[PDB]
Write a protein that binds this ligand. Structure first.
Ligand SMILES: CC(C)NC(=N)NC(=N)Nc1ccc(Cl)cc1
Ligand SMILES: CC(C)NC(=N)NC(=N)Nc1ccc(Cl)cc1
Ligand SMILES: CC(C)NC(=N)NC(=N)Nc1ccc(Cl)cc1
Ligand SMILES: CC(C)NC(=N)NC(=N)Nc1ccc(Cl)cc1
Ligand SMILES: CC(C)NC(=N)NC(=N)Nc1ccc(Cl)cc1
Lengths: 391, 391, 391, 391, 391
């Protein structure tokens, strides 16, 4: 077996492995559009001749706490032929891409995991949490305090592309987890909004000056509406869109994949009607350069200046000083006050997981409980972390 | 209809309403043990003659952030006959008990809600969150970092009552949400640990010096073990008990009703195996005396001294100064900087809900985003809020 | 918001609201064929610019007891945008159409209800009952008395359109509930008889000189045949078609949406094999002109001449004389002997609901039990009321 | 009603009956390809004018024990209109085809039965057994002894047609139950390997020099892979293909319709993971000429020479001598030592059913237990009987 | 941890581990009756003080092909505390019991496996196959050939204990897999035949001079009868009992756990009505002494004398001569012609698995296909292998 950058002649072999590996593999046409986000030298293949393994990264822009946008290597299209399992192909492909990503200057890599048990050992930690809420809209009444007690329009998505793009662009710059959505991914999204013979029903949109929701009736459950994406830049827009969704009088239930701090339940007289039906890891992060990542993000202003020594397992030891919402992270050989594997740092990085929770599992080790409280407070995000789109 | 404290002659009428109202109504014997926690004048009935409504409170001790224990009026046994709906009986009974609770000197009242839409309008806010985790133990492997890589014993619960009582007593004093469990409730718990003809299977216990788990196989799904209660005072005890539960080799699944910050998922190589199968409000709080409650709890040391003016809707306006982890809360007629209904304060009080999340639903109103960040940080609990036992 | 007859420019806005409101919305092509049944001034829209509400009526011909055919305004395509709920749009649109229908000379309006709780307050009463029967054909044996112990042919529907049209035309003139089916609706029916990729299987027909059945195998349950429509003008035809349907030896079950007096169960040695799997209101009626409707239908010859005074709530008081199967219905200020809301009269009108049943719910009020027996007998239909087709 | 060979003018009438009778009826195009396997005079129709019954046979080649290939009449496309049940059409059509098959010189006829209770009385006995195995691949580990501890390639079926044809051709000559697969059936198979809108997902192939597997992900259960066909000429190929199928890491389950002696379970450390989820009769046989069939197949060499007298109910009495793996079967009027109906002989013929098992049901009658043991041993097949393809 | 024979003081500790390990653990009373089958020194415990592991064997009598009865060590009550997994306790307990069993003179050990992946590596091979058949009795018609076209009585089990014992005793001596059922196990069986509050319904019996069936209606599915045990010594008795079971006119379905050669399906006009709903390994065998086991059983008379050399992996090499239905098995250092692990021999031993099937998985290795055919024929059982009762 050999590992190398694919030639044009490798891509049909890659698309066969993709079709056999991914049920959501639209086809070679969709694949060729995503391919425009893959840099030169962003892809590796393993050949036995025939393609038996592949992996690549896309050039992404990820928003982190403090509204800072990082260049991010988005791992995707990772697959090993069912004929070639347990031969170290995944480890070899991840080692080569990680070498290329680090050499190229990316401070972070990111992925969506097909299973929970793979990517930890390669230094990825789950950094966003997906939370599905299902509302029994038949009983849903808005609280007396809820805003907006007709700013929303029901529209055809393909006729309002410009407005969706501009709202999304405002949203993604404000929210940790936000990703820049390039033109080719808007092309894909609006092509999926069409009804397909034997497939999805037509998508509709609810459009506010400061937010939109895209939804469709479920293929088989005709009383369920699924919200594919709701992006609101203001609380007024979020509440106005939910008032419209709860007005889908022919549905029994509205479901959305959202984040744990979605204020929806608080909009209703019965908080219990917004039921959590599913929870899962969303975006995973591998911190490629510990000092560049820790100095780049903003920190909570509420915690007073403090200094510590952080060791990442096989990733350096650093003097970490955090104050006035900024970190300075410098090499040191001083004794470590905090130790953790690289994956744990990625889990902390967008504020989705508390240092004290990881400490209670012994994933993060310190003898100082005051230092733990300070890290928890500092790494917290003012704006709750959300998940942009899967890749 | 008349509202009054019940006489001894009213109790058979109350037990009939209870049997008709509550499916979990063990019987008059269990009821008579809980009755020892009801103070003189802790109960009201409505008569049409026959009992058509009832409500009472029990004397409880609730742990709040800072390890402070508050006298708490636990509302329970609330029922209105199906013959007497929509006649204002619940509002009349809650108004009278709230008068008695406030006059008696309780700073807080608490309940478990049969539905989500009732108790908000009486000033109760959901203050703890129940989180059911279901583990597919067949795939569960402990992370290399997990502690305890035989401190636990498999025992009969009724033979180790003293040890369970002492561990629980340590747990409940340390954790916000903790409740003192009186002798009569230990009597009930150990009577429910017995197998019943046509009912529950036998409970077993896993016992560590610093924690215990009580579990039983499900009545009908013989491959599911349900953990009824796991109380761990140390991280080592928590991990050791889960190692033993994952060693129940005849089960496919282990389920527990826990809290959102349970570190279990982080103990495993695959965090996704600890699946969230259910989430719901647990304990609800009504703040009866705003200054006594806000001055009693401890606050985060990480936030610097700040002053604000808080108005509770029909519950006073106060100068609120928070610093060095303590609050001072004094009458003022100065302009309000923060306004919220009483129920919202109860939701904030144990740190389960963020001020910024309630603000995004307009349940809490301020024009100062810096003040919101400061309240979020100050009201946060170092020790995650848990739910003790239902009542 | 403004209410008006739509211009040609409004129809794309109406088709967007329709797609978002109705899951069964084939598309703009099907819509344009139904549109040929809508008279000039048969449609209203509400604009905010954009269409946020719509309603129309079609010109129909409804058969009532005595084989009398009434011009009928069939309400359809009624929808309010999810953005515009609770603003009185439905009440405003129904008030305007009802004004136009009454002014145009229609004695009755009719609809199929999307939910049971809407149309009562606008004067519509459920007037036909849908009854789904599911037969376990594996056990079905015909009684010794059953007729037809090969008059039926298995055919392709599109090749026998003329014969279906002529049988249906005989059926609809004989049966209360019958509707004239115009050419455009035969076009639609035969287009739905085609198999669709990802959709319905091919329909087949069973054809007798005096009846037909259209059926298809269910999309997903391949052992269920669904009869979409069985129209039999004679008992011999009805029994012959069921003999053929019970001969679908590859099916386990045959289901049909029929009426409560379907004689099918009586054809079998085991009446219980024709199981009632679903029951629901079918056609709803609003009596627009009380005297024109009550004088138009025929009444049971078995009841002797009687006179009464009927008051319809806000719909007039009338001297009602019924004899020799005919009614005379004239204005009076004499004291009322019978009172009911308009919706109740529509429920009585085709004989689907008994006066004595509505009296027992206090929907119809009299102090005379003899008068109730006389109304029950008079309003009964000799020929059981059936449901023609949905609109 | 009349029975005759169809004219070209009958075929549209036959295709209508086929569409109404068979849910798996691809269409007239697929039907016209299978039609090339039907000999002149291989088809009968019943007319009432219109086609109300049909039956035909195809020219097949069936492998029997000893690697002997018999000309076989494959009954197929048998249907009676639902209008014409219980009129003896099936018996009349089977009697005429059986006359033509016997006169033409076929020693055996075969079919796949739509139900288990029809074909016994026409002399067909179930001769192969279908066994569905479902593997929970997440737990599947190969035994230390299992062969092949990368000979297999993941390929697109349509690009390797030549290789599939050559492996299948080797398989079908070696295994009892094997059928020659003509070019038109390879055309059909590779056309079904394509994804269909609203239908099947794309098929992939696993290709070894000495075996192949064709599989697809299930339409609706996206964690189930269904193996449509696995043909392995060697044990090494069988194990190598299963290693690759168990490497489909995105599936939970792999299902296959195989035979009772599939060695798969023995390849795994946990034999129980290969679960039997379904069992059913596969190919049915009617022995048309008792001596030609019994002399044609090979018998077990392990049993010593023996002689008996076999009577088939209304099918002759024969002196049957079996030795050195060969039978001689000659007319006799000597007393019968063994008696059975024709269907029972067909059940014994490929070794799928034991003589002693049929004797215990009194389907085969002898007074000699030693003769039963000898027949069981002689009729056993060295190579386990498999099912080729349905027709 | 220490391993030793338990004292009387250990048994309460063993019964706690048993209750926690086995859901079917009736209680200490049932346990004390089974305990009478455990020889002195038949039990081992591991102590940490407290019991953390246990295993024992019972003295059984197992019928093998040729109606030979072997003393058999039945392993049972094997459990390791969930606190003590992965410490080699099971391997240590099995090694000690196997030492004691071998020293005591048992030629074979046997068990029922809680999972399929444990006992292989300790030399146990699955030797019987459990086959659940579910009959839709509503369609079941007996074939014209079926025997018995009133020898059976419906009786109360507890009144006919003597007759059940005598039939079972005849059955168990005739059938490979048969076990002697001691008086204490008849006591248990007849105590389980009683209805329990919240548990099983009453059992009834069908009693023939030469067979019995015990059955009960399912706890929850009131249209399912479960046959717990059917023992028939003659084909006439087997058919007569099934005629009576198919006469349970209030049931839809009759289920039984039987063996793969049950002739039931052949008794019916539709063989497919006896559906295989479940298949699993039953009894597992460990051959403790290869020559004593191979010389003890009878072999097929149909195969001519042959000689080979068999090597069992770490269990000896033997000259194996089989002729006239008897084996001679003597030490040799000649080259092996056949090799297999000990577990494989146990799988072959009662005739449930074919040598050629195990060879195709490479669990049995020879270069001689003629030798494989001879072993398959020789190890076959004339009387099909059945499973007596679980332990
Ligand atoms: C929504 C998700 C599942 N879509 C993706 N998986 N992203 C994706 N398919 N990514 C991808 C990237 C590059 C190429 Cl060349 C081909 C595919
Ligand atoms: C575990 C919960 C549901 N148990 C309770 N509901 N508490 C409870 N039943 N409380 C209660 C309190 C007082 C009396 Cl007199 C009777 C009953
Ligand atoms: C079978 C039923 C549901 N079909 C209808 N709903 N009727 C219907 N769609 N009616 C309708 C009438 C007029 C117009 Cl312009 C557009 C649609
Ligand atoms: C895979 C099976 C179900 N396919 C078949 N049934 N065979 C089949 N359809 N046979 C067939 C034979 C001849 C003619 Cl003309 C038309 C059809
Ligand atoms: C029917 C089966 C499951 N019953 C058994 N497991 N046998 C069993 N429990 N055996 C057993 C043997 C000895 C003792 Cl001391 C205690 C129990």
């Amino acid at each position: 077996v050999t590992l190398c950058s694919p030639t044009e002649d490798d891509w049909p072999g890659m698309f066969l492995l993709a079709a056999a590996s991914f049920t959501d593999f639209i086809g070679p046409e969709s694949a060729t559009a995503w391919r425009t986000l893959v840099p030169t030298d962003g892809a590796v293949v393993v050949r036995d001749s025939e393609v038996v393994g592949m992996a690549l990264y896309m050039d992404l822009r990820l928003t982190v706490p403090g509204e800072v946008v990082l260049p991010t290597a988005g791992l995707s299209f990772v697959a090993v032929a069912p004929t070639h399992r347990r031969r170290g192909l995944l480890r070899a492909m991840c080692a080569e891409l990680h070498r290329r990503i680090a050499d190229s200057g990316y401070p972070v890599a990111a992925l969506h995991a097909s299973e929970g048990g793979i990517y930890g050992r390669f230094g990825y930690g789950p950094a966003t949490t997906l939370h599905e809420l299902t509302v029994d809209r038949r009983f849903a009444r808005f609280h007396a305090d809820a805003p907006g007690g007709s700013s929303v329009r029901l529209v055809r998505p393909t006729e309002h592309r410009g407005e969706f793009e501009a709202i999304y662009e405002r949203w993604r710059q404000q929210v940790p987890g936000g990703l820049l959505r390039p033109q080719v991914l808007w092309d894909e999204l609006l092509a999926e909004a069409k009804a397909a013979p034997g497939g999805d029903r037509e998508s509709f949109a609810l459009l506010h000056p400061d937010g939109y929701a895209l939804y469709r009736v479920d293929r088989t459950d005709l009383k369920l509406a699924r919200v594919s994406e709701l992006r609101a830049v203001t609380a007024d827009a979020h509440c106005a869109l939910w008032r419209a969704l709860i007005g889908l009088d022919s549905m029994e239930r509205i479901s959305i994949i959202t984040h744990p701090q979605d204020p929806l339940p608080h909009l209703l007289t019965d908080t219990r009607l917004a039921r959590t039906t599913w929870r899962q890891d969303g975006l995973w992060l591998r911190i490629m350069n510990v000092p560049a990542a820790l100095e780049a993000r903003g920190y909570a202003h509420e915690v007073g200046e403090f200094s510590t020594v952080l060791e990442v397992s096989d990733g350096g030891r650093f003097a970490l000083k955090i104050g006035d919402g900024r970190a300075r992270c410098t090499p040191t050989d001083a004794a470590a006050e905090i130790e953790m594997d690289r994956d744990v740092l990625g889990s902390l990085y967008l504020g989705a997981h508390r240092a004290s929770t990881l400490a209670a599992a012994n994933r993060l080790r310190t003898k100082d409980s005051q230092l733990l409280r300070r890290l928890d407070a500092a790494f917290a995000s003012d704006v709750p972390v959300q998940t942009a789109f899967e890749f």
